[model samples]
Target: PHIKRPMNAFMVWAKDERRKILQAFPDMHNSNISKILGSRWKAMTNLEKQPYYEEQARLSKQHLEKYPDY
Candidate 1:
């Protein structure tokens, strides 16, 4: 019963974004893709980030249910 923590907002969003980048540029280097992703994350406005935060809240709630003592 080693349930791991659910991903925070940015990480969850990054996972999806990474998939899109990989699909668009299968040949792109990992480091290069990371750099691009990092820049994109930094440039996003709070409004854009709000969705991810909302998602994080949902995930966190699930985590609490699964690991109440955590």
Candidate 2:
């Protein structure tokens, strides 16, 4: 069986920010959004990154429960 990967810390952060970023730039392309998210992630300090890291940890834990065989 193919295993779906869990979201990483950066991705969990991106998912939360995407809508807000989109609202700020209504006509912006998604490609641009990714660029912006990547840039923003780099600028963030570890303290700011902690929540997303925790979210990723939670998802990773849940993934194993959902697909222990994977």
Candidate 3:
């Protein structure tokens, strides 16, 4: 098994956004949701449109510390 790299900010947001989107669209196809996300990508603001930062911040800490020597 390989140690996983922590996601950079936007990828992190995508994961959070994708999961949240799925909550409202449990049966949506991956392509359906991906296009929806892509649509929003144009409207993306690196500012605080959605603040799941703290949620994944510690999630990063939790991973890297285990592979600290890496």
Candidate 4:
């Protein structure tokens, strides 16, 4: 079976905001995190996303090394 690789850094970066987002929207449904996160992610500048993208590339390279056939 293929291993489930880690999420890319943009996903990681966005996911890290979950706690803050949930806290800000105390009345929001748990299922709404994706909606909110998507909106926020879309609104971000390329500059803001660059670091996460770079990190993701780095992680992907590592994954390739670990699972060459994958």
- Could you tell me which 10 consecutive residues in candidate 3 have the lowest summed lDDT? 1-10
The TM-scores, one per candidate, come to 0.67, 0.75, 0.53, 0.60
Candidate 4: residue 62 Cα off by (Å): 1.7
> Candidate 2 regions off by >4 Å?
1-6, 68-70
Cα lDDT, all candidates = 0.69, 0.74, 0.63, 0.67
Model 3: clashing residue pairs? none
Residue 44 lDDT, candidate 1, scale 0-100: 72
- Would you give me the overall lDDT of model 2? 0.74
For residue 69, give model 4's deviation from the true position in Å.
Answer: 6.7
Candidate 4 structure quality by residue, lDDT tens digits, 13-51? 666665578788776654787777777787778678878
Which one is best on lDDT?
2
To one decimal, what is the Cα RMSD in angstroms of model 3 from the true structure? 3.8
For model 1, the superposed segments whose C-alpha errors exceed 4 Å read: 1-7, 68-70
Measured by TM-score, the strongest candidate is 2
Error of 2 at 27 (Å): 2.6
> How would you order the candidates by TM-score, starting with the best?
2, 1, 4, 3
Q: Model 1, 1-70: lDDT tens per residue? A: 2234645656667666767787997776667777766666776776898888887777766666876675
lDDT, residue 57, candidate 3: 66
When sorted by lDDT, best at the front, the candidate numbers are 2, 1, 4, 3
